[PDB]
């Protein structure tokens, strides 16, 4: 699954929204949060993010693997 990280934070972004096949893009008020566990491993949202920052959970660096955990955790609650 593909997940947001850090160069995405920025008080009410709107791009990775009405594109996701399975509507698994959720706000953490400031920024969107992808449920990796609902995301069907596509590549649309990244291509849409006008920064290029959404990477595979595996690919996101260990420093930022914290966000993969957070993204997981958000909805596993
Ligand atoms: S488009 Fe990019 S910057 Fe915006 S919320 Fe999504 S991932 Fe974050
Ligand atoms: S990669 Fe696709 S399925 Fe996954 S969150 Fe992004 S748009 Fe949705």
Swiss-Prot record:
At the top level, the lineage of the source is Bacteria
Q: Which GO terms describe its molecular function?
A: 3 iron, 4 sulfur cluster binding; 4 iron, 4 sulfur cluster binding; electron transfer activity; metal ion binding
* Necessary cofactors: [4Fe-4S] cluster; [3Fe-4S] cluster
Which keywords has UniProt assigned to this entry? 3Fe-4S, 4Fe-4S, Electron transport, Iron, Iron-sulfur, Metal-binding, Repeat, Transport
Please indicate if the UniProt record lists Ribonucleoprotein as a keyword. Answer: no
Provide the binding site for [3Fe-4S] cluster.
8, 16, 49
Pinpoint the 4Fe-4S ferredoxin-type domain residues: 1-28, 30-59
- Residues that hold [4Fe-4S] cluster according to the record: 20, 39, 42, 45
- What does the entry's cofactor note say about binding and number? Binds 1 [4Fe-4S] cluster. Binds 1 [3Fe-4S] cluster.
Which InterPro entries has this protein been placed in?
4Fe4S_Fe-S-bd, 4Fe4S_Fe_S_CS, 7Fe_ferredoxin, RnfB_subfamily
Assembly and partners?
A: Monomer.
Tell me what this protein is called.
Ferredoxin 7Fe
Provide the species name: Hydrogenibacillus schlegelii
């Amino acid at each position: 699954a593909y997940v947001i990280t850090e160069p995405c934070i920025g008080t009410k972004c709107a791009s990775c929204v009405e594109v996701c096949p399975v509507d698994c893009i959720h706000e953490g008020e400031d920024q969107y949060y992808i449920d990796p566990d609902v995301c069907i491993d596509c590549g649309a949202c990244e291509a849409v993010c006008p920064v290029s920052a959404i990477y595979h959970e595996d690919f996101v660096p260990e420093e930022w693997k914290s966000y993969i955990q957070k993204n997981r955790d958000f909805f596993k609650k």
